[PDB]
């Protein structure tokens, strides 16, 4: 199993959506690996791996709410205004 | 700060959580459960009160089509400027 | 600073509410 | 290259400045009050028109103050 | 302040009088007042009709103070980010061989 | 989040309880204009211009009961909060321009155009209606602030000046039998004097800003009064 | 019938699950406002035609009448023409609590009716919708109880690169 | 005679206020604190 | 004679104070109240250890945590939930076995 | 005498509201943890499968 | 009146009768009225028919002028009795009443049953014709003097004080005439020597710049229904 | 590049920034005071609503004052 | 990259800033005596009321140039 790279370093540069998903799969990721532990121990899971699955919940409640805007022709309208190249320009231009 | 942390309370009891869709959903079942019966025509301004000024908002909240991404209401960290999730 | 914050206003501004809407008319009388 | 700078206590400078502009505010209502007491003392009777506005001018002299706070709490917290 | 009475019919200046940003819109130029806000302030306050400058203005600020405020500040849509996450619209559709269930009859 | 917290009157209640069961009669108001509006007889208002007198009474009352009970050490201001205090001028505020504006007399605004005809209307005489209109909300805001930072700047000033006065009575009242006794006593004496001043300061700034809170929303509620003339 | 209390639980679960709103569903929630506009435009347009009848003679003369405001020549037509339509016939023209209901219980009746009806019809569409909105909506209707993670469960689609979660 | 209260003052000065009138004046020229 | 503040008791007096008499105080009142519980009534985890204990968060016990964990005790055990189902852990019940098994 | 017997029971009210208040109510969210709650969550779903 | 179970025991008899004699009296007072209104609309001076509009000197708010919207029909008596014009006004409090219970019940669909049992149990708000004896209408008398006794010292107060404080009377026959206005109802007052006391009050408020809360109060005193 | 700073001494340099506006402060207050003996010079009589009036007035700029003293104290406390 | 950096000399930069705050005061009581001096001339029969006022205004602002003293001491120990 590898973690995904949810770091502000990382995230920066990186859509929401993906960011929400890495985020959950990791969620997952560390629930399984505590479920797997329990069981392995042979305890019950629910009195350990309360926590993650809290974690699990969440995560899903972000990822579900978030709903990537449509490209249609509003949008698109609003995007080219704002971005214009004098903008485009002067981002690129500062070093931030 | 030891100045500033003078300017508080002194009598907090205790505290109590809940979760907006918990008490949310808690209050549109008491709703739904008050404006059901048939004495209350659904043209009523009673009713009209409870239910449109809800569905307007609810619609509005569909409807939104945002190009920006608004972090969620109930994050388990808000204090980090850098990290909208 | 507490008193610029606002993670708890609401119940904090519940004194107030109180005050005005159920101890100002035992005042008044 | 370009090297990009975050400072953090900058600040609190430019929060220091904006105070500054409630000197210009104390003085100018020290001014309108000083006024008052010799109108006062010129045509007493008239006291009360003076009077509010002195009180009219202390609003106004107060208001622009405050846009000074506005930044500078703005900022403080920047 | 004082008592505000409202101007007889004889007392009101005729419309021609009324001065726009550049000149009088007299004849020829009358279908221009509709679009000159100028020339409709002057006539208003020739009219002794301010309150259609003052109310709009006021009730506006309040509109702003009171409503539109923190809906902007809570609700408002921020300014889009440079790279873009657009929708790729493949979400929501049911997976292939679900059976769904049969709408009410 | 839900908070379970008390005021800080219990006591002042109680006090209040026993000393009010039977009537007794007021005539010290810390705002005494807000029960005389008009000062030239047979002017009389069909606005309902009394009815600020109870709303007047009960801030003057609880501020009261809040504020000057502070002084005393380790008293607590259970509403010092900005937002707080927000919320109650905007009640106030909001409250009566909505009185006002619910009246649907829309000449009642003329005079936010300010100037004369002279003036241009465009490019001066809207310029100060917009500044107007912005200048009553200013008015609000300003009102609520600088009733926050009063109290809190005061209560910070009281506390720094006990913390020095506590330290300087407790490590250093020795000098007393030593040599260097006098510098002791003159700066003891200094200590006093600055302890009484800002006691005798805070209570009479706490009841003046009382009388500005209550003053701005009269001043509110005067500038859409119009008074007429008994014939 | 009281469709708002059913679609509720609906709407909240589809704003708590809005990623999976389809293009489609989004278009009904446009053309659910677009007839909220409409609906209180000619709710509106209705009262005024109501407050417009039964305003008082003396009323109209003074706001149809001179002077005019801009005084171009239509404006003058104009007024002069709905003046003597209005002043020709006999008009009931009541006063307080009768105008009040004149005015407004025909406008609220009109506007809750539109509503109502428009509230249906959303109802109908989500409905006959195929997609994961639709099949909620469906399940609420038949169990009267919103399932919530239906779109996991059912495993509903998602974009390519985030499959993963599925792969069980 | 008794120690108890009388008709209320509220700490005015009767021969000052603005209804000095409606309190009688006696021979020493002190109006009444009541009716 | 008949008067409201003193004929009337309490509740009904109150009523008649905030409808006949400020009425337009208590509306916006109960709007401004509306607004705080709508908009300022959330208070995130980070939030409570920066600013919500009067000494500071003692982390040598995170209380935080144990809430957090009887919360969701409390909520598998009275909703039934199974939180070995696959979309939780994302991977189906004999991959979470074999995974025990492996470590 | 309404008034007065009224006043009497709110001030014995009040002063054993403020006796509790002031000598026997522990804070909430103690450091240690020896005093007062730490909070809890309320309104719990219970009974409702579906819901997760 | 305080509500009481044996009244409440009444009314609940009488609801359905009431409800038959409240629809004949409506049957009866429409045409009364329809005869008065077309009198007035064709017989009415121009000012009263067109409604003319009547603006407070101050914030320019429309209300009833008594001289120009209050017209008397000198010569009703040839269509309209005086028997019938008692019965239109019998009927119209009945039937302000009566809408005002109507409208709250449409309001608030079946919630307002608790509401109509407090109601019965009172005979303030309740029509006259819900009374089917003399003793009932005796008691429906003495609850509708009650309210009258309830409400109409505060509009006079409120009447007296508000013109004391802001105003005084220009000579000594309006002094008298002032002061004998509101002298209670034990001593009996000469109208000569109180009418004076109308134009002093027409130069201070008419009836055009009634205050709203003193308009409650007479509605109050007139049992008409404010809410 | 991407650089990050904080200076713990900066608030400091703040702080006495906003002590300069009590220099507005103190000088209203003299100016008041400075024409408060002149209306008392020829209108002795009327001494009582001069003083009160002065009083009001250092009142409102010891507000001014307070307002930058609480911010010298949060940027030197904190 | 993130620095931590602290400056040893800069609390010598507040301290000054805030001894300026001294120059308002000093002026203040000049006008004060200044005005004094005048209103003596005027109305000599009152000089004993008008040097109490004086006095009295000055205290009010020896206790401003305190205030901002009081910031100066703390920076410069502190
Ligand atoms: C789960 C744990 C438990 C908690 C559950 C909570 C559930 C919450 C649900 C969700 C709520 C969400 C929203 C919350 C927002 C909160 C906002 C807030 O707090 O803002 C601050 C703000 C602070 O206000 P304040 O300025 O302090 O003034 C309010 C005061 O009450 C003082 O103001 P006042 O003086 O103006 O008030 C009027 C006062 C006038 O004065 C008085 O009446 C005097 C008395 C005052 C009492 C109230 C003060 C309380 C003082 C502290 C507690 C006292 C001791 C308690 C001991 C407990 C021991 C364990 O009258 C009264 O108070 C009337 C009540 C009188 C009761 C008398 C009972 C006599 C019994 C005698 C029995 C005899 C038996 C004999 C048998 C013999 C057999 C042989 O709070 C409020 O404004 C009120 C908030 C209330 C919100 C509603 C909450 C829901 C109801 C909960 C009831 C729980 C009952 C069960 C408890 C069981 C024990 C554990
Ligand atoms: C009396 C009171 C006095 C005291 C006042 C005291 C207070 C101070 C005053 C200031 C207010 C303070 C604020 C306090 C809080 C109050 C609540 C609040 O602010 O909530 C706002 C809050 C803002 O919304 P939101 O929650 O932020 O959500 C934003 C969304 O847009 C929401 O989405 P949605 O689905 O709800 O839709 C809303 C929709 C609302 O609108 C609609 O739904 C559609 C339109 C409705 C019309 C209503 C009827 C109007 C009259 C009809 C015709 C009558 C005459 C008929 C006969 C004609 C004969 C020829 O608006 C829009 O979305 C904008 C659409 C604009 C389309 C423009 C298309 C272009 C062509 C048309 C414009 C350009 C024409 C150029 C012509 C050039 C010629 C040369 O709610 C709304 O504004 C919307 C809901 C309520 C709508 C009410 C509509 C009626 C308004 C009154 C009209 C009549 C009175 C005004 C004139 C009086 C003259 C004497
Ligand atoms: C659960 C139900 C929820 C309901 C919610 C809806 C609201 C409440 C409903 C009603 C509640 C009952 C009480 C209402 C107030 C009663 C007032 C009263 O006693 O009047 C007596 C009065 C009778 O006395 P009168 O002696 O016969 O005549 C009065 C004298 O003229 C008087 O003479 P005067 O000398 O006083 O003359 C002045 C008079 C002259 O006026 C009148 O008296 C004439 C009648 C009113 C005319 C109003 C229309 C004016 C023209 C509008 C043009 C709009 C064009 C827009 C074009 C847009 C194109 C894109 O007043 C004015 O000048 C005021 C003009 C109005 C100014 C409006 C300013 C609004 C500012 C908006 C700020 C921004 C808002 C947010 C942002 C929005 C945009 C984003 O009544 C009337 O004349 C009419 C009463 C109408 C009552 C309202 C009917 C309600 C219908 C509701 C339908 C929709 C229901 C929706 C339900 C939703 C689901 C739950
Ligand atoms: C199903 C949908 C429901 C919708 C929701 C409704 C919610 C409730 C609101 C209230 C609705 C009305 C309730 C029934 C009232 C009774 C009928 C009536 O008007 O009685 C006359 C009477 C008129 O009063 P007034 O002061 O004498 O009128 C002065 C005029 O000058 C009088 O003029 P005049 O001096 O020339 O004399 C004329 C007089 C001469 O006549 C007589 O003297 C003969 C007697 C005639 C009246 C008899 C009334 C009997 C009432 C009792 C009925 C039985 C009750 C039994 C209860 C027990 C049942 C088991 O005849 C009249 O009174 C005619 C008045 C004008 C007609 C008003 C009706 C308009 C609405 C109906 C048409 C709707 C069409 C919809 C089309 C839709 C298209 C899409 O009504 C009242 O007492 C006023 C209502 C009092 C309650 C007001 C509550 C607030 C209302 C705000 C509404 C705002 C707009 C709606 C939205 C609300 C959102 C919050
Ligand atoms: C079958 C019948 C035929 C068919 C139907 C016909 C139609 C019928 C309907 C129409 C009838 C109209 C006439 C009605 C007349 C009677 C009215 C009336 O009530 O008179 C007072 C009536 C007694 O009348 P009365 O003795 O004859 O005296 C009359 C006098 O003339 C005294 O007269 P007064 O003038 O002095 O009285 C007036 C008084 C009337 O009020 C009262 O007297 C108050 C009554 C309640 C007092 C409660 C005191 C006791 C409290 C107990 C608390 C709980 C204790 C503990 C319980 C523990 C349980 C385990 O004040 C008012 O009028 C105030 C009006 C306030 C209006 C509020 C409007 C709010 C609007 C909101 C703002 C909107 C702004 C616009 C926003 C726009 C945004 C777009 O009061 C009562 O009988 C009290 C009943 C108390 C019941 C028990 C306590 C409450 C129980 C609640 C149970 C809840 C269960 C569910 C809980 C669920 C939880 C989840
Ligand atoms: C408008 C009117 C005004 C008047 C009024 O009504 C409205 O105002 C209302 C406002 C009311 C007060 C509001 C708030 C409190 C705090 C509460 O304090 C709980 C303390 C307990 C909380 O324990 C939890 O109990 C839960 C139970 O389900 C469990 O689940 C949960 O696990 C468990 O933690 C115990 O605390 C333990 O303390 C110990 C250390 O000391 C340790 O053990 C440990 O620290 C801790 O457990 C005691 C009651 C009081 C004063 C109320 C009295 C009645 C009123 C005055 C009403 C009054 C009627
Ligand atoms: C650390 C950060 C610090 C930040 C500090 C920021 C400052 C915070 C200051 C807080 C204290 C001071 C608060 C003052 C009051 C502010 C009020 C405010 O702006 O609230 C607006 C808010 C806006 O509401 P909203 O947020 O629900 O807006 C919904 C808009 N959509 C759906 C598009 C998202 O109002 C409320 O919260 C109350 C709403 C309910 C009450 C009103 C209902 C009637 C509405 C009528 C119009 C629409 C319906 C049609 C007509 C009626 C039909 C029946």
């Known amino acids: ?96 | 700060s030891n100045p500033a942390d003078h300017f508080r309370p002194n009598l907090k009891a205790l505290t109590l959580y809940a979760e907006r869709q918990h008490y949310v959903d808690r209050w549109l079942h008491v709703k739904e459960r008050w404006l059901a019966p048939w004495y209350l025509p659904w043209w009523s301004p009673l009713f009209q009160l409870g239910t449109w000024y809800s569905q307007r908002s609810r619609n509005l909240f569909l409807v939104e089509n945002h190009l920006s991404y608004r972090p969620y209401k109930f994050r388990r960290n808000d204090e980090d400027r850098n990290n909208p999730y | 600073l507490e008193p610029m914050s606002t993670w708890y206003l609401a119940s904090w501004a519940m004194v107030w509410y109180y005050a005005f809407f159920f101890w100002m008319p035992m005042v008044w009388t | 290259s370009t090297v990009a700078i975050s400072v953090q206590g900058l600040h609190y400078v430019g929060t220091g400045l904006a105070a500054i502009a409630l000197a210009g505010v104390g003085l100018g209502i020290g001014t309108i009050f000083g006024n008052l007491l010799v109108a006062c003392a010129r045509q007493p009777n008239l006291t009360k028109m003076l009077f509010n506005y002195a009180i009219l001018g202390f609003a106004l002299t107060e208001a622009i103050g405050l846009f000074a706070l506005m930044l500078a709490f703005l900022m403080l917290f920047s | 302040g004082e008592l505000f009475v409202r101007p007889k019919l004889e007392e009101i200046p005729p419309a021609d009088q009324c001065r726009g940003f550049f000149g009088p819109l007299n004849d020829s130029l009358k279908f221009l007042r509709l679009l000159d806000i100028k020339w409709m302030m002057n006539r208003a306050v020739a009219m002794r009709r301010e309150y259609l400058i003052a109310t709009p203005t006021l009730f506006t600020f309040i509109w702003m103070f009171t409503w539109k405020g923190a809906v902007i500040y809570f609700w408002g849509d921020r300014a889009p980010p440079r790279r873009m996450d657009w929708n790729t619209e493949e979400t929501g559709r049911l997976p292939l061989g679900f059976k769904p269930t049969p709408a009410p009859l | 989040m839900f908070l379970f917290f008390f005021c800080d009157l219990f006591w002042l209640r109680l006090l209040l309880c026993m000393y009010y069961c039977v009537w007794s009669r007021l005539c010290f108001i810390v705002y005494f204009n807000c029960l005389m509006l008009i000062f030239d007889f047979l002017l009389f208002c069909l606005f309902d211009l009394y009815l600020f007198v109870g709303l007047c009474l009960f801030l003057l009352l609880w501020f009261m009961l809040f504020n000057l009970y502070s002084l005393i050490l380790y008293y607590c201001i259970t509403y010092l909060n900005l937002y707080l205090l927000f919320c109650i001028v905007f009640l106030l505020y909001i409250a009566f321009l909505f009185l006002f504006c619910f009246l649907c007399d829309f000449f009642l605004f003329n005079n936010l155009l300010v100037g004369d005809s002279f003036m241009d209307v465009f490019f001066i005489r809207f310029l100060l209606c917009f500044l107007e209109c912005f200048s009553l909300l200013c008015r609000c805001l300003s009102t609520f602030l600088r009733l926050f930072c009063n109290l809190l700047s005061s209560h910070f000033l009281l506390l720094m000046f006990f913390d020095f006065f506590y330290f300087i009575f407790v490590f250093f009242f020795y000098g007393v039998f030593c040599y260097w006794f006098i510098l002791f006593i003159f700066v003891f004496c200094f200590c006093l004097l600055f302890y009484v001043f800002l006691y005798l300061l805070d209570l009479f700034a706490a009841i003046l800003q009382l009388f500005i809170f209550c003053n701005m929303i009269l001043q509110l509620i005067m500038d859409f009064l119009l008074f007429l003339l008994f014939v | 019938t009281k469709y708002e209390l059913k679609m509720q639980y609906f709407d909240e679960w589809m704003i708590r699950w809005r990623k999976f709103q389809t293009e489609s569903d989004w278009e009904i929630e446009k053309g659910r406002q677009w007839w909220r506009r409409f609906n209180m435009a000619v709710s509106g347009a209705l009262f005024c035609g109501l407050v417009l009848y039964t305003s008082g003679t003396a009323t109209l003369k003074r706001q149809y009448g001179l002077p005019h405001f801009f005084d171009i020549g239509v404006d003058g037509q104009a007024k002069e023409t709905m003046l003597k339509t209005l002043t020709s016939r006999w008009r009931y023209t009541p006063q307080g609590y009768g105008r009040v209901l004149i005015t407004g219980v025909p406008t609220y009746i009109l506007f809750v009716t539109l509503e109502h009806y428009r509230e249906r019809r959303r109802m109908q569409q989500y409905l006959q919708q195929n997609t994961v909105f639709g099949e909620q909506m469906r399940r609420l209707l038949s169990t009267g109880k919103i399932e919530e993670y239906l779109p996991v469960n059912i495993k509903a689609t998602l974009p390519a690169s985030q499959q993963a979660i599925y792969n069980y | 005679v008794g120690n108890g209260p009388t008709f209320s003052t509220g700490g005015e000065c009767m021969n000052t206020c603005d209804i000095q009138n409606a309190f009688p004046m006696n021979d020493r020229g002190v109006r009444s604190s009541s009716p | 004679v008949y008067t409201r503040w003193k004929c009337d008791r309490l509740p009904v007096f109150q009523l008649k104070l905030f409808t006949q008499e400020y009425p337009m105080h208590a509306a916006v009142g109960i709007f401004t109240i509306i607004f705080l519980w709508k908009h300022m009534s959330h208070c995130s985890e980070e939030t409570e250890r920066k600013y919500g204990w009067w000494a500071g968060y003692p982390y040598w016990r995170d209380p935080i945590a144990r809430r957090n964990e009887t919360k969701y005790k409390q909520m598998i055990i009275n909703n039934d939930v199974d939180i070995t189902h696959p979309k939780w852990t994302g991977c189906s019940v004999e991959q979470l076995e074999e995974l025990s098994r492996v470590v | 005498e309404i008034q007065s017997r009224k006043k009497y029971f709110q001030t014995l009210g009040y002063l054993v509201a403020f006796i509790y208040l002031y000598f026997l109510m522990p804070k909430e969210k103690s450091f240690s943890g020896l005093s007062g709650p730490d909070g809890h969550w309320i309104m719990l779903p219970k009974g409702r499968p579906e819901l997760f | 009146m305080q509500g009481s179970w044996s009244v409440l025991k009444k009314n609940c008899s009488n609801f359905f009768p009431g409800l038959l004699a409240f629809a004949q009296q409506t049957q009866e007072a429409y045409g009364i009225w329809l005869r008065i209104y077309n009198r007035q609309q064709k017989y009415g001076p121009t000012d009263f028919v067109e409604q003319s509009e009547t603006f407070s000197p101050d914030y320019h708010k429309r209300f009833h002028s008594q001289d120009k919207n209050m017209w008397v029909d000198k010569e009703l008596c040839t269509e309209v009795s005086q028997k019938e014009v008692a019965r239109l006004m019998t009927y119209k409090l009945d039937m302000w009443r009566m809408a005002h219970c109507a409208g709250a019940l449409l309001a608030t669909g079946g919630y307002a049953i608790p509401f109509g049992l407090f109601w019965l149990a009172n005979d303030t708000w309740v029509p006259s014709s819900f009374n089917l004896t003399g003793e009932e209408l005796r008691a429906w008398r003495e609850a509708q003097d009650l309210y009258r006794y309830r409400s109409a010292p505060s509009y006079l107060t409120d009447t007296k004080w508000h013109f004391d404080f802001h105003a005084y009377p220009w000579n000594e026959t309006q002094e008298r005439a002032w002061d004998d206005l509101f002298e209670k109802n034990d001593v009996r007052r000469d109208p000569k020597v109180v009418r004076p006391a109308a134009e002093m009050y027409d130069g201070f408020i008419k009836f055009e710049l009634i205050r709203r809360k003193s308009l409650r109060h007479l509605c109050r005193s007139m049992n008409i229904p404010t809410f």
């Open chain 1, 1 to 96: 199993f590898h973690f995904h790279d949810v770091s502000n370093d990382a995230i920066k540069g990186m859509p929401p959506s993906e960011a929400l998903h890495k985020h959950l799969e990791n969620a997952q990721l560390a629930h399984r690996i505590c479920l797997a532990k329990a069981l392995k121990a042979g305890e019950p899971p629910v009195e350990k791996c309360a926590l993650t699955w809290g974690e699990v919940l969440i995560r899903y409640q972000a990822w579900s709410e978030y709903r990537p805007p449509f490209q249609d022709s509003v949008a698109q309208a609003k995007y080219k205004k704002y971005w214009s190249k004098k903008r485009q320009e002067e981002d690129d231009k500062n070093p931030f």
